[PDB]
Amino acid sequence: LAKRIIACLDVKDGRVVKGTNFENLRDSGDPVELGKFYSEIGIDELVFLDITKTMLELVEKVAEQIDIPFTVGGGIHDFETASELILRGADKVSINTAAVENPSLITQIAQTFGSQAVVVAIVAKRVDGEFMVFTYSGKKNTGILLRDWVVEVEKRGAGEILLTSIDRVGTKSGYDTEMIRFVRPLTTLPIIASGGAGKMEHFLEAFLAGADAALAASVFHFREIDVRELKEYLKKHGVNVRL
Numbered sequence: 001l002a003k004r005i006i007a008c009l010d011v012k013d014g015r016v017v018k019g020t021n022f023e024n025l026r027d028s029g030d031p032v033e034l035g036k037f038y039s040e041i042g043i044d045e046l047v048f049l050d051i052t053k054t055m056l057e058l059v060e061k062v063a064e065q066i067d068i069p070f071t072v073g074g075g076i077h078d079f080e081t082a083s084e085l086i087l088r089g090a091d092k093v094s095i096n097t098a099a100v101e102n103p104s105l106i107t108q109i110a111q112t113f114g115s116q117a118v119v120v121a122i123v124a125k126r127v128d129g130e131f132m133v134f135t136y137s138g139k140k141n142t143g144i145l146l147r148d149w150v151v152e153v154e155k156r157g158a159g160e161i162l163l164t165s166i167d168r169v170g171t172k173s174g175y176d177t178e179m180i181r182f183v184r185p186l187t188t189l190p191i192i193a194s195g196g197a198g199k200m201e202h203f204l205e206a207f208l209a210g211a212d213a214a215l216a217a218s219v220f221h222f223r224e225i226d227v228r229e230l231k232e233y234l235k236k237h238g239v240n241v242r243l
């Protein structure tokens with residue numbers, strides 16, 4: 001099964017939170033324009049993340065303009081919101097804090113739209129040598145061990161785990177490959193590595209650690225990595241991608 005490259009677009013009020021400077025692009029803040037561009041250059045999937053209704057309009061336009069899978073995330077707190085996002089064209093929804101506080105939400109979405117529709121995002125940090133699950137964008141220690149939550153999440157019916165290591169996020173220092181390795185034998189689900197990507201070699205390392213997809217925002221936002229070059233590089237180094 002081919003490894004996937006996934007671009008994460010941070011969105012506020014249905015616009016991309018710029019500093020973008022895509023001169024080739026007409027409007028760097030239009031998420032449909034930016035998403036379509038990524039689609040065309042070889043990105044395999046998109047994640048639209050609301051960092052703060054306008055989301056429903058965004059999903060609508062994205063759905064009819066873009067022909068690759070896309071996930072929506074960021075403050076989905078209930079079944080009704082997930083349902084509405086999926087019906088209006090989102091392929092997947094990502095939930096985190098709302099999954100920790102009501103794990104049945106996972107199962108409710110999976111039963112209604114299929115397991116492949118639910119992505120559970122997990123933010124973990126090291127606390128006294130143990131990986132612990134944090135909610136509220138890394139503000140709250142749930143007291144839940146990463147090793148138990150991963151097992152609960154699959155059991156509840158999740159289709160994928162988006163594995164965010166908050167202490168690598170934005171740093172460009174590499175993915176947290178130790179955490180990916182820790183999670184790999186605990187679950188059979190596809191693991192999406194998230195946070196830290198800085199150079200092509202970092203993607204290789206994440207795939208070697210056992211990720212099935214690698215998500216990045218910084219290196220695609222700051223235009224640092226050519227997607228096609230990245231795919232050729234991974235292929236050259238024995239990683240199965242699609243070209």
Ligand SMILES: O=C(O)c1ccccc1NC[C@H](O)[C@H](O)[C@H](O)COP(=O)(O)O
Pocket residue numbers: 008049074121123137138164166168169170171172194195196197215216217218219
């Ligand atoms: O997804 C969240 O709510 C969240 C939570 C805690 C810490 C970061 C969070 N989101 C940030 C995104 O997941 C972030 O864009 C990705 O991890 C990719 O980051 P970079 O590629 O390092 O720029």
